[PDB]
Amino acid sequence: SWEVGCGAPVPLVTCDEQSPYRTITGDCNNRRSPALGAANRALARWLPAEYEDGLAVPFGWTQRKTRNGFRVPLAREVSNKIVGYLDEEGVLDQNRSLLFMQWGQIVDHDLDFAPETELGSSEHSKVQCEEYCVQGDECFPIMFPKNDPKLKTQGKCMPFFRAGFVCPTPPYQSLARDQINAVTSFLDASLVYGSEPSLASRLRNLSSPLGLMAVNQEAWDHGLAYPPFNNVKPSPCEFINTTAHVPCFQAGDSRASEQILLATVHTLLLREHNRLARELKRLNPHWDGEMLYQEARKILGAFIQIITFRDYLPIVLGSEMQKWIPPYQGYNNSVDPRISNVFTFAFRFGHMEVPSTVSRLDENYQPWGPEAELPLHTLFFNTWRIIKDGGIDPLVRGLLAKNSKLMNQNKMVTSELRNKLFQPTHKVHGFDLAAINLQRCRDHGMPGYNSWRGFCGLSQPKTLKGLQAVLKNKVLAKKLLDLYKTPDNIDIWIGGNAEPMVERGRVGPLLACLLGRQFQQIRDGDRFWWENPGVFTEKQRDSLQKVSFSRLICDNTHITKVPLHAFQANNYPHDFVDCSAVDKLDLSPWASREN
Template sequence: MFLVLSFKALASEKLTGPDILFSINTAKRLVDQAYKLYRERAKENLRNPHLTPSDFLRHLKEPVAGTRTAIRAASYMETALDLLRQKLQKVWHRRFNITDVLSIQQKDMITRATGCDYLIRPVRCPQNSPYRTITGECNNRKHPHFGMSNHGYARWLPAEYEDGVSLPKGLIQGQLYHGHPLPLVRQVSNEIIGTPNEKITDDQERSLAFMHWGQWVDHDMDLAPMTETSIQNQDVHCDTSCNYTPPCFPIKIPPGDPRITKPGVCMPFIRTTPVCNPTTFIREQLNSITSFLDASMVYGSEEPLARSLRNQSNSLGLMALNQNFTDAGLGLLPFESNSNSICLYTNRTANIPCFNAGDKRVTENLGLTALHTLFVREHNRLARELKVLNPHWDGEKIYQEARKIIGAVNQVITFRDYLPLVLGNEMNKQLPLYKGYNDSEDPTVSNVFSLAFRFGHGSVPPFVPRLDQNFKPLVPYSNVLLHLTFSASWRIIMEGGIDPLLRGLLADHAKLMKQNQMMVEELQERLFEQLELIGLDLASLNLQRGRDHGLPGYNAWRRFCGLSEPSDEAELAAVMGNSQLAKKFIDLYGTPENIDIWIGALAEPFVPYGRVGPLLACLIGTQFRKTRDGDRFWWENPGVFTPWQRRILSGASLSRIICDNTHIQEVPHDVFKMNHYPSDFMKCSEIGGLDLSQSDEN
């Protein structure tokens, strides 16, 4: 105790107000220089004729607008704290955490001077606004930052870092956890995950639309951006470095790797960007989009992006469409304005850039692009119909009303059609009937959910099916290998538009996640592979991401959910229902306590009628309950819509949206269940639609 008090006294003496301000100003200068260098280097990289798989991943996670400001503030704070630590280290030669010795006044000074006080500034919310803000701010009037974009993920359990503050577990070789070292993530991937493309099992009860809707919903709720800016070592290159040099946390390759045999090679990995944490200064990750189910992937989570996505040529409340191409007369998404668009590199002769949408990941795969296109068309269809019914409305009113309906429809489809097929028998337990808005419920997406909801990676098949009007393979474009469709916007323009893709989603199978078939080779070995370049391993990325985020291990989350905690191989075998798999886990991790949350949760047998195990059912169900109950604009909350409007919205369906916005004329009633053509399909005329005639009763 005496040592702590004497150190605090020393810190107070050595870190005066001017000292702290000098460190902050130095930090700002270093950070600004690093960001300038990074931007120049990124531009130079895009002139390179051969992009790496990491370049594609960077593009999908690249921060925009206000996210960049939030990231820079966090960098200012992190760098200033590091400079202050270095200053004290010269006179205090023991190990310490700088945050333990700063006074409340000193912390407040750092928070304000770095701009990190944006997280805690008081907000005055309007009393009677009928529409959501784009950023999610003021959804909760008591806690205006709940669920807002560019804030940190929620923590349901405390973070576990190597140093208690920011260093990821597994960083120090030989370090023991519960008496055992952590295995290399690539070793776990090799021994438990990998499945050759030709050895997968089709899911006989879930369609490809089921898999894609999961990703669609995920992209509505969370995006953890990353930036390769290095403050302390500006010569670091995460593509080539095998050393831990922030922000690089390279994935080391185990001996005898089946694919990567060259010595001294690592798989690149960039840490998720931290967010300011003015309370404890412990590293937290930034969620750059809103936590609400509000269709932010259509409209954006920041005002400048939202405005740029609208059709500014008239006052009809429409979304902007592509000015160069149509899809057999129907609208396509506009192109992004970047002259070095990464999509140009997937087909140099086509010269087609990436599409622009409310979420940066729009062109990650073709099914996702098809859903984005579908909902922008649906917005415009609704806007035109609302204008006819309400000719006195201006463009802003039409835009907001159409946006409100699109958000509600996504909520209906997700809770009525999608989640019951995920959670199975656990649905009613995890998501009891809606009882109304609860302003004490925090809907902020949790850090663990950002990993748990990646369960869908186990249901991705290796091929992208495209079907013709008769639901037969579209020759010659059917069944392209998945890795050849990443960021390939040109395939939408030049290979038949979105109709063939949507038919494939309706009439083809999702992959069945099995304990011996967890992830296809296309994702585990060829992620973002283009041409001859070595692809990334999505399983290794997921495992490394969990450690990057400081997520506790498998048993900690079993305890959180009130489930049993296996303590040895026999008990783990009972939980997994698989003694061979349990042995693999124990051989790798030594104890169930150490198993990385993503792989441990994914490996559990499904709950009855679901597609996740008990642990994932708990984590996913808990998040969606908070997302629903903590949303003031939830479609069922009285006052958001009239009773008549709620009755109409309850009948909304993805089938009808497809009918209304494509040339497809036959659809199944339930798109997420596996359907066979023609026996399980019906004419569009048999599918009910939304009656907007009483869209506004005020």
Template sequence: DSSLLSIITEARQLVDATYLQARKSLKRKLEEKIVNPMDFLKHLKDPIGRTRSAVRAADYLETTLKLLIKEAASLWGTEFQSKTTKEERQKEMISKGTGCDYQTRSIKCPERDFYRTITGECNNRNHSHLGSSNRAFARWLPAVYEDGVSVPRGASEGKRYNGFPLPLVRKVSNEIAHTANENVTADRQLSLVFMQWGQWVNHDIDLAPASGEGASLELQCHTSCAFKPPCFPIKFPPDDPRELSSDTCMPFVQSASVCSPSTFRREQLNAATSFIDASTVYGSDDALARSLRNLSSQLGLMAVNQLFRDAGLELLPFENTTHSVCVLTNRSANIPCFKAGDKRVTENLGLSAMHTLFVREHNRLARELRKLNPHWDGEKLYQESRKIVIAINQIITYRDYLPLLLAEETSKWIPLYSGYNEKVDPRASNVFSLAFRFGHTSVQPFVSRLNESFQPLCSSSHVPLHLTFCAPWRIVMEGGIDPLIRGMVVDHAKLMKQNQLLIEELQNHLFEQTEVMGLDLGAMNMQRGRDHGLPGYNAWRGFCGLSQPQTVEELSEVLGNPKLAKKFMNVYGTPYNIDLWIGAVAEPVVPQGRVGPLLSCIIGTQFRNLRDGDRFWWENLGVFTSQQLQALRKISVSRVICDNTHIRKIPRDVFKINTYPEDFTDCQEIDMLDLSSWKDEPESTDNKASPCSSCIEFEQLFEGNTVL
């Protein structure tokens, strides 16, 4: 036991030293203003708050195990699967010594709750951790690792799977995914707002942060092509169109793992709450949530930028940091990254615009509710406004977005709502975190910014996408969010076609803000799938009850494209080795939909679980009164835009493509959210935290089966 404790201590010291090196390294690079694309990506996926503690604990555990294998193999063996009392006690010691015991600590949930927690804890009263932040993703199929524990498939050169070596992901990207910026087919029915909503809701559901060790001086993940955790570099094939030396690789940092002291198998951590709960606005961590609020008064408001306004309207606050990576996208402007409930807020301008809209919407609601209920305190105003913002996000996603995405498959995977089911697991699945990246194939190569007449804002209003990553200065200094929203409303989404999967901007120039080589998003998606131990394309076809093609003829039938099937077979050798992401996005879409049968199954299953396993779902009995439900059903993205920008004319359905001015309606014609049913009288409020006077009746009628 004493030797085990000393090994745990050594592991903690090693990890702490690496973390310190990583921080110093990034700080020095920012001071010297020398960054590479990986630094931008790392900033967006850096663990913060409780996530950082959870990730570090997992790193302590992993390092402890490595030291044990190295120094005490004769005593422990390498499998650690024995169930003897002594080893169980030692597992407990490891769990406590590394801080991993937080995973098993019980949470005492309040007897009555009127609002969901920030962390998602206690949504399910019987299993309080389900759907909460900083927990492992759900596994719908067992993980597939080279060593059965943690090594990604493809990490060992020459190793064969189903009789063939796995191809380099960059080779797959070059041969199957890549399309030139000029060779893009526009979606004739859907706008860029539709594409942007997909990313917005995805960021609400999952975030796999980067390993905390990914930027140390020794492991910069771009100085070597060797697999040395957490570096899993993307190698270039000899015939790559980029002229590179043979020892050059594209850096790639593995996703952070979560503590799994019972099995020691690598599981990735979801830093966000799984629920659709606007965690993008409010955060998934209590400390972060508090820091995002304006607590200087009892008005229930979100904090906003104190230095800049957007033609009189609020902008997001800046990060509280001396050296911000966003400053380096325009040094003379000196504008840092925005701060929001999700770290990825500044990843692109459309996403920043969505964040800004909903922070403004929260504050608008808080002010309106205060006029109706001057006796409500700041906490009540904050929670009620938050509750409405969450409902808006849930309604738009399920009523407006998913039916356009899944079309006739919608009702098959997401039947009519029949109430909360505590037996449904609402956790985001590991496979969904990869599958929902289908949206990368709908991104256009340019960002448009339009004036009040929907004409280009200026000569430079049509900006290449890669020059807008991590560039909040373009919002602050170049006209705010209105021009961006106008551009998204009238611009077509890119159509996902089998010969046009990923634009050049994302396939070669991701985060290329400097002269340094940009990243390849398609290759990274496939490398991420391998990093996460996800089974291949055919395994997921089997999971969904679909055929599993074995020959080029059968694959041709599934893809409806013999030429593409042959390409896949030339690259992979067998359909069983095809990476999930590339196989799924290559399928022909379901009639009228925007994804194929496999993605329809994974996405539909996930969204049904997110709804049915959410005790606070907006339609669940007792969450809102019948009058409030009636009012909420009238909301729309168009109304949110009208209420929170200077835009005065808007299409009724901004997800669909519209032409200016014929398809545009005056904002006065768009249904407003009537808040009158949220008014209550001070004398009738028995409990300040209660959202409605009828909740007590609901509790008596449906005790244990509803949310209050």
């Protein structure tokens, strides 16, 4: 097949072609095909899309239309029967800090975003979907099954709107609908700087030639910076607290304030850029603002890349790490660096790592105040708890000293997310992320579980007994075929997450393959990979070699006590050292001599 380049893409892109820095949009990374990995293009299709009409209509759209002879089960019913659980006791990951979960969200937000279609500014279908749960066009409501408690308290459905797609916004009819990735596929700190020129500029402080990112002028964190407020209304952060009237933050990625710990991590990264830009000024007084910004940006990008590939991915992929992401061999322009559609669901393994509560901890890493621990749901789009309740330091301590939730075949997604999710423009803490995920899978025309099993060279269970063996769980496999009459129909998100975890990892074989291939690609096909010869000097690379999330915390908060290995489960005071013991980023090799 179909047009090799479908329209509706801004075409005003010229490549500098010698520029030592990334573009904001990701264009110009690949010299032979400059659009590859650029934001606001179609997600890559590793396999042909599968829609009930072969083109755009999701499986589950037409009641009579089956998938492989069987009706697909309601997303909310799969959620109720499989994904939910009551007892939060014993669910915590004994050897992963809460930061392990949080870094996952960060890296996802750097890589992909498929926003809901708009097409209704004065839109009343925004209410026709909300109010009356009537399916049509981009309204694809998540209907409650019979016996669902939400049917008694929340009406007939949860509203759900189909993801935006390429070229025209209005549906096309000859080639399979392609969803948009609104951010750059390259791991390049686009969640900090934006993926659009329009946003990247607003985020910058262009009042002073210091190459700084703009900061909050209203509020301060004991002399430390907050991100600026997004002053546009209606704002969901103001909504969740009428009295507080504290807006969401404004970051390079719009999702930054979805939960307090994500906002917290965005705060750390913004602080890091300004910290870096200041040092780069001392070393190079002659560098103008643009050079400073670009050079600090480039450093942070390297930081994110190294933390992700050196510290994070090995403890996600475990034994599969080396199988899918071998040691680096240089840049390869034949590699497609685009995030695939399926990856955006594969990376949602993180949803089962999120615990039910968030804690604030004082300087002895003990409960900060009388309500130190809070239910996760009271922290969706919550910025006031940061500004009016002790800044980000007590939250960072929690990130270090508390555990991620462990994925559990019996206890998949906490009810803080599965029953009490809050969504913007929507008013209640009554949504289901798991149901959303499944509905979204179908929205995006995902091939089924077995198609992806085949993709990864894995066996394709056809019977209850084959599925029991694959999952090593009789009860779970029974529930899955009871709902999906065949493992061919099992939505990839639940299928992949249902598999037991690989040795030393936190995902199954199917996911490790989908994640592994993707991360291998975003590295190998990134012309500005930090370790690609020429991007940095060798001396610079030696300096970057010693970055640590521990150091990031020390440099950018008033925390003085940190663990060496921030992602493993660390207990205070034993596993914690003084910041003085922690390697620092030696910026001296960035000194640029004139004469």
